[PDB]
Amino acid sequence: PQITLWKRPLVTIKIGGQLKEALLDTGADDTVLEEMNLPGRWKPKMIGGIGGFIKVRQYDQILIEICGHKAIGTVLVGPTPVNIIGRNVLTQIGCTLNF
Amino acid sequence: PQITLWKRPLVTIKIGGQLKEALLDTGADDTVLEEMNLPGRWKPKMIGGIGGFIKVRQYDQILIEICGHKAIGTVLVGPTPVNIIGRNVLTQIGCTLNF
Numbered sequence: 001p002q003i004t005l006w007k008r009p010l011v012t013i014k015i016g017g018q019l020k021e022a023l024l025d026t027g028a029d030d031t032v033l034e035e036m037n038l039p040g041r042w043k044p045k046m047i048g049g050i051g052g053f054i055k056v057r058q059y060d061q062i063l064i065e066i067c068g069h070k071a072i073g074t075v076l077v078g079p080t081p082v083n084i085i086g087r088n089v090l091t092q093i094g095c096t097l098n099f
Numbered sequence: 100p101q102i103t104l105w106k107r108p109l110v111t112i113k114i115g116g117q118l119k120e121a122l123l124d125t126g127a128d129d130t131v132l133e134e135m136n137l138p139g140r141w142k143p144k145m146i147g148g149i150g151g152f153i154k155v156r157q158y159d160q161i162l163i164e165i166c167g168h169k170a171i172g173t174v175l176v177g178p179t180p181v182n183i184i185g186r187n188v189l190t191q192i193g194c195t196l197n198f
């Protein structure tokens with residue numbers, strides 16, 4: 001669909017059999033989710049944001065569905081203020097910016 | 100135009116009579132620009148994200164031109180690692196997400 005930006009672009013996503021609300025974030029290279037129980041092996045990693053760096057759990061080849069669009073990519077799990085959907089996932093669902 | 104998400108959506112902006120590269124960021128409520136000596140009054144503010152918070156200076160009713168699209172609104176100035184164009188400006192230039 002076309003999504004205007006007068007509100008936060010929040011969407012219901014499905015990961016690990018759970019539904020969650022996430023923010024479509026064209027300023028994030030990577031997708032970062034709040035603390036959660038995800039099945040599958042993971043590797044430690046660090047990501048930095050506007051305020052510094054945090055510790056995350058990196059899950060590769062994770063199934064994600066966004067508004068009926070399926071993705072399979074890396075998901076970082078850690079103390080992010082918000083579930084954010086980064087470009088690694090947004091490209092898989094064919095998301096573009098237009099003005 | 101249409102901008103894909105394979106790479107960071109960097110564009111040229113014009114503010115305070117200066118040209119700069121900024122990130123079109125649907126995940127940002129407000130525009131936040133690298134440290135620059137803007138004139139006029141301002142109010143302190145703190146914005147938070149991954150890594151915590153940074154303190155910024157909020158100027159209101161600032162003219163920004165994004166690839167020819169004119170906008171006027173709030174602009175936050177502070178030690179951000181990247182120039183960020185937020186929804187407050189993305190709405191004024193008619194930007195949308197599409198997938």
Ligand SMILES: CC(C)CN(C[C@@H](O)[C@H](Cc1ccccc1)NC(=O)O[C@H]1CO[C@H]2OCC[C@H]21)S(=O)(=O)c1ccc(N)cc1
Pocket residue numbers: 023025026027028029030031032047048049050051082084086124126127128129130131146147148149180181183185
């Ligand atoms: C986390 C979001 C809810 C909000 N952020 C915008 C977001 O797009 C930042 C914007 C951003 C981009 C680069 C550097 C710092 C901040 N990107 C980000 O944190 O992505 C991280 C995950 O993937 C990596 O890619 C970039 C950083 C990593 S934010 O920078 O902290 C922010 C908060 C408030 C305002 N008014 C403006 C921006």
